[PDB]
Structures are given as C-alpha cells and as structure tokens.
Ligand binder design. Structure first.
Ligand SMILES: CCCCCCCCCCCCCC(=O)SCCNC(=O)CCNC(=O)[C@H](O)C(C)(C)COP(=O)(O)OP(=O)(O)OC[C@H]1O[C@@H](n2cnc3c(N)ncnc32)[C@H](O)[C@@H]1OP(=O)(O)O
Ligand SMILES: O=C(C[C@H](O)Cc1ccc(Cl)cc1)N1C[C@H](CO)[C@@H](c2ccc(Cl)cc2)C1
Ligand SMILES: [Mg+2]
Length: 411
C-alpha cells in the first residue's frame, strides 16, 4: 500500500503508534561515516542542483516552480504564490545549511523540475506530559525523560514536483537525497507537516479562516453567502456588517516591533511556548530573524506601556493565485504566526491582529488549531475550513498528542 513509506523509519500504522509510550529514535544509531559520500544514483537526463539563496536568479527559479506547481485547494481554484522575499526569509534563518536545499534540474536546459528544502530547528520533542503522568504511575520516569533536552533537527518544507513529472516516483528520490544530506551533518530526526494522510501523524488539527473582505471572498468563490443570510432583503450587506472591524487598533500601546524589543519578546515567547509538548526554542538571532517586521512578508506588533513589552503578535503574508477569475488575480491571506499575552486576554490581543490585517488590505486571516488558537475562534468569528493539517516526525517515535500541545508554526 506504501512502496516508499514502508521502507522508512516512521511508525507504520495507527495501532503501532498506539503502542508508543516514550519519545525516542525509531532506527539503529548510525554515524556520518556510515553514510554514502556520493549523491544518490539519478537517471542520466537529470542532475542534482544546490541553489544559492543569497543569489537572485536561483531564488527566482524556485519561486517560479512553486508559483506554477505547488499546493492547490482540492477543485483547482487557488494555488499558493509564495513571494521571492518570503522564500529568502523562510529558507535562510541563522546558521541555515545551504546543502539541505535540494533540487533536480533537467540537464539539457537547467529547467527546475523538483525541489525540497530543509532548515535547522531546535525542537523540544521529549515525552509528552500525559505520558509522563502515566509513566510515574508505572514507576518509569527515567525512560520517559531521556530525550527531554531540545534537539537540533531538520524542518522540511516546500516539497514540489513539476506537474509534467507527477507520479513517476520522483518525490521518494528527493526525500532519500534530503535524508542523506541531513545525515551527512550528523542530524537524524526531521519534522514535517502535510495536508495529506501518510504513515503516520503524531497530531492533526483543523484549518480556520476569518473573513476580512467578504465581498471579494464570495466573488472568487473562496466563500459562499451562507443559506441563513437569504432570510434577508440584502444578504451581502448583512454579511459585510457581520465581519466589519474597527479602523484602528484598540490596545493603546500597540506599535510595530523594533530591534530593541528582541530580548523581551524572546523572554515572553519562550515562557509561553514552554507550556506545550512540541515547540521550538529560539535564540535572540532567531527571534530577530523570524519576528522583526519585513515588508510584504512578516508583520509584528508589541503592546508596550510603561516601557515594558508585555504582549505581542505576528502574522505572515502568502498570496494565492486565483486560477482565472475575471476581476481578481490574487487572494491576499494573512496567517497567524507566534504570539504571547501576559497582560490582556488572548481574544483582545488577536482582535488587534484582525484589525491591522484588515487595514493593510488582507482578504482573510488563516490559522491551524495549534497553540491556544481555540480560545478565540468563536468571539473572533473564525470558521473551520476543509480537511486537516497533520504533523509528522522522521525517525522519531512519539505518543499521539492533541493539536493544542503543538507550538511549531510551519510556514
Ligand atoms: C533526517 C532527515 C530526513 C529528512 C526527510 C524527512 C521526510 C520529509 C517528507 C516530505 C515532507 C514534505 C512536506 C510538504 O512539503 S507537504 C507539501 C507537498 N507538496 C505539494 O502538495 C505540492 C503539489 N504536489 C506535488 O508537488 C507532488 O504531488 C508531490 C511532491 C507532493 C508528490 O509527488 P508525485 O505526486 O509526483 O508522487 P511520486 O510518484 O513522486 O511519489 C509517490 C510517493 O510520495 C508520497 N507522497 C505524496 N505526497 C507526499 C507528501 N506531501 N509528503 C510525503 N510523501 C508524499 C506517496 O505517499 C508515495 O509514496 P508511497 O505511498 O508509494 O510509499
Ligand atoms: O503545513 C504547512 C507547511 C507544509 O510543508 C506544506 C503545506 C502547505 C499548504 C498546506 Cl494547505 C498544507 C501543507 N503549512 C503552510 C501553510 C501556509 O503557512 C499553513 C496553512 C495555515 C493555515 C491554513 Cl488555513 C492553511 C495552510 C500550513
Ligand atoms: Mg514523480
């Protein structure tokens, strides 16, 4: 049923996952020395390629492969369109490893045909809290804590095979060669997410959307007018009214984040992310990289009164291509990123997120039900979308957890 995934060090079924009680590796410990020095064999018409991301033309080639061939919704109406500026930001965090960005080009023309990217992440991934309770009841605390310390692993994203190359078992060859390159740097675990079911997730969560520009959403058929609104003389006018927002933020000390805020934002974020079983650990340089505002890419605001940063939120932009509509070419979506509240309720902090995103011209705000994203779904008028996002590890046994125990945002 799975010719590739059945050969890989991942839990194979749900009931296998069910017998997992401690975090730890699936496979045999291995060394760099054991790993083949040479690239995995490939068909003689293709060649491996390592793009240079601090070079404009290389970023542009991967930008076009993704523009034309990356994730679509299920009836081919929208396709993600990550910008070039976004891709440099996402692929090049501090101390990234250039050879973990893995491409396949056609030899004859150098046309990009496939891509996969890995980046460093420091991740807490020790036995979850509920399994530590079950462990103490059994007398098994030591085995439960063996992998408690944060691990330097790989986060995978941007797997893409050209449309003309689909269903030829190319994705396995990409994944094998990524795994070899990661293993050649003495890294043995990866974390990845997908909107498809594979063997075998450790957590799953629904998608959620908050309409900001409802007349445009209905026009492009992102949204419909729901049935209930027909009882009204003017269904659309009442839909606009339901989703209207203030013009300016409600929290008085709200302002954009600046370099001097890095230490306080790091502090309050890390204190918050501690409450979750699987969560990233960020250095000052990584807080700077992922949170300081960047035009058209990432937007981050702090609440400061009395010269302390006590709360913040962030969101990132990804436009999607509207696969041809007469009036509109692009859906401009804002995605909830990291946040922390210490002085005001989480709903009151995120309302300011919606208000900023709306004033800056975003059409919809999107998020998965990770972190504490549930505490504000009803009052802030988010709705559940279609399907689920699934979270996975590579070479890591892990007890099933709820998505509200997951704190890793995947860009
Ligand atoms: C220690 C370091 C390790 C690092 C690596 C860790 C693992 C990283 C894993 C990657 C995490 C990526 C996270 C993301 O970026 S999720 C985003 C994935 N990208 C898209 O959905 C973009 C549009 N679609 C495509 O570009 C292609 O359809 C892709 C590339 C997805 C598949 O290409 P194609 O359709 O031409 O198929 P094939 O004949 O070549 O290959 C068929 C095999 O591929 C398995 N398949 C299908 N979809 C996925 C998927 N999303 N993750 C893992 N495997 C997937 C499938 O079950 C089958 O195996 P098996 O069932 O026969 O066994
Ligand atoms: O899991 C990932 C990264 C993964 O390798 C590739 C992927 C891209 C899109 C989707 Cl659909 C699923 C998986 N995501 C990237 C998406 C954009 O940041 C993010 C998302 C958030 C909220 C909504 Cl409502 C929809 C999507 C999920
Ligand atoms: Mg293929």
């Amino acid at each position: 049923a799975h010719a590739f995934w059945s050969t890989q060090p991942v839990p194979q079924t749900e009931d296998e996952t069910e017998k997992i009680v401690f975090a730890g590796p699936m496979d045999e410990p291995k060394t760099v020395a054991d790993i083949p020095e040479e690239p995995y064999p490939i068909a003689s018409t293709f060649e491996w390629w390592t793009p240079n991301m601090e070079a404009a033309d290389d970023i542009h080639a991967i930008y076009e492969l993704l523009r034309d061939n990356y994730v679509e919704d299920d009836d081919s109406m929208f396709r993600f369109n990550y910008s070039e500026e976004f891709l440099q930001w996402a692929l090049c965090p501090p101390n990234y490893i250039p050879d973990w960005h893995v491409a396949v080009r056609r030899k004859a023309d150098k046309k990009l045909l496939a891509f996969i990217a890995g980046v460093p992440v420091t991740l807490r991934m020790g036995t979850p809290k509920y399994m530590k309770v079950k462990a103490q009841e059994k007398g098994e605390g030591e085995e439960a804590a063996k992998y408690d310390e944060p691990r330097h692993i790989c986060e995978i994203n941007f797997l893409c095979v050209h449309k003309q190359l689909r269903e030829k078992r190319l994705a396995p060859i990409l994944i094998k060669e990524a795994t070899r390159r990661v293993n050649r740097t003495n890294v043995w675990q990866a974390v990845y997410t997908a909107g498809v079911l594979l063997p075998t997730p450790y957590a799953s969560g629904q998608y959620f959307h908050r309409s900001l520009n409802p007349e445009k959403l209905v026009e492009i058929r992102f949204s419909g007018i729901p049935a209930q609104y027909q009882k009204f003389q003017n269904p659309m006018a009442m839909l606009k009214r339901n989703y209207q927002l203030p013009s300016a933020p409600k929290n008085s000390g709200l302002r954009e984040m600046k370099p001097s805020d890095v230490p306080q934002v790091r502090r309050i974020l890390m204190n918050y992310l501690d409450s979750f079983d699987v969560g990233p650990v960020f250095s000052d340089a990584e807080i700077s990289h992922y949170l300081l505002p960047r035009d058209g890419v990432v937007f981050t605001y702090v609440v400061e009164n009395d010269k302390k940063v006590t709360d913040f939120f962030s969101f990132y932009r990804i436009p999607s291509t509207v696969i041809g509509n007469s009036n509109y070419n692009l859906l401009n979506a804002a995605y909830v990123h990291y946040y922390a509240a210490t002085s005001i309720p989480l709903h009151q902090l995120i309302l300011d997120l919606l208000i900023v995103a709306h004033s800056r011209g975003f059409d919809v705000c999107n998020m998965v039900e990770i972190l504490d994203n549930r505490s504000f779904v009803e009052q802030l008028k988010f709705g559940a979308g279609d399907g689920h996002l699934r979270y996975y590890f590579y070479n890591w046994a892990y007890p099933k957890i709820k998505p509200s125990q997951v704190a890793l945002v995947m860009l």
